[PDB]
């Protein structure tokens, strides 16, 4: 009955739909998904992750994987600086996906996590040292 944290590695790479990634984790691993962060773009378009519970956006910088990059936050989820820093196009897809996410996922519950029934899912990149 050991608890599981989930880390979605390799956001530097062109990946699958993180929605679909949640299905594969719930369906095939028989365990609930509770997103904590959410990727904004992937591959050449990875811009960072929006934290769902802190409501802010940590901005990914390319190739600082050897040390820890400068923590660069954009506060609001509708902050027009998220549009400026990420492009308003990608910024809306963040907003859209987040809508769908809330209707098909889970709030992180500490009790169910310790019971091994939901996993806190973090999206990141261990190579870029971002999300760790």
């Amino acid at each position: 009955d050991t608890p599981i944290l989930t880390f979605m590695n390799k956001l530097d790479r062109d990946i699958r739909d993180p929605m679909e990634l949640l299905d594969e984790v719930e369906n095939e691993l028989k365990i609930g998904c509770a997103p904590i962060t959410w990727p904004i773009g992937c591959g050449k378009l990875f811009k960072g992750v929006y934290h769902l519970y802190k409501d802010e956006t940590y901005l990914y910088q390319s190739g600082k994987g050897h040390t820890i990059q400068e923590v660069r936050i954009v506060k609001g989820l509708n902050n027009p600086d998220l549009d400026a820093a990420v492009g308003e196009d990608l910024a809306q897809q963040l907003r859209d996906e987040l809508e769908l996410v809330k209707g098909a996922s889970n709030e992180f519950d500490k009790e169910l996590f310790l019971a091994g029934e939901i996993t806190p899912v973090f999206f990141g990149t261990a190579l870029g040292n971002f999300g760790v």
């Binding site: 062109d14 990946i15 773009g41 992937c42 591959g43 050449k44 378009l45 196009d89 897809q93």
Partner: protein, 176 residues
């Protein structure tokens, strides 16, 4: 011959302004449009346009049929307008439009920003579809070509800018 010997029927609405060897058609939409001809003689009259050769020209007919078709597509040009549509394929692609200049992301180290020409506009109903209407058939066809060009469809996975009328062969890599 044939296509040439066919009618053209100027739909009630188009101006049809035949000034010697210069035909200008305007209607509903479309900034007019006015091309030229040569060995073909065109004749208005009634509710149509007739196209025929012209003694002394062996180009005749052939030049006349292309006249027809052209002129033909010019009517319809300002009438119904003209089609388009391209879809992007492959993770991390997607297009924008933000005025009359389309912004493209295609896995280079830079966006592309292609700027639409005169009488032709386009929208991105989806991150991954460009639909561009216009009057000048000869021009949409171009801007399509020109766009698709930034990243023609590779024949292994299919990534790149397709039309929809696409066919994408796609084949397997050499055995091991």
């Amino acid at each position: 011959s044939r296509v040439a010997k066919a009618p053209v029927v100027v739909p009630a609405g188009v101006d049809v302004k035949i000034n010697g060897q210069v035909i200008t058609i305007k209607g509903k939409n479309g900034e007019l449009t006015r091309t030229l001809n040569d060995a073909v003689e065109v004749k208005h009259a009634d509710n149509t346009l007739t196209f025929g050769p012209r003694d002394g020209y062996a180009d005749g007919w052939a030049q006349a049929g292309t006249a027809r078709a052209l002129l033909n597509s010019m009517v319809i040009g300002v009438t119904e307008g003209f089609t388009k549509k391209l879809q992007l394929v492959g993770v991390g692609y997607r297009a924008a439009v933000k005025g009359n200049v389309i912004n493209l992301s295609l896995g280079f180290s830079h966006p592309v920003d292609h700027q639409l020409p005169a009488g032709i506009t386009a929208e991105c109903p989806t991150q991954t579809e460009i639909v561009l209407k216009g009057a000048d058939k000869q021009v949409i066809g171009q801007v399509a070509a020109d766009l698709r060009a930034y990243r023609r469809p590779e024949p292994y996975k299919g990534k790149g800018v397709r039309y929809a009328d696409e066919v994408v062969r796609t084949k397997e890599a050499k055995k091991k």
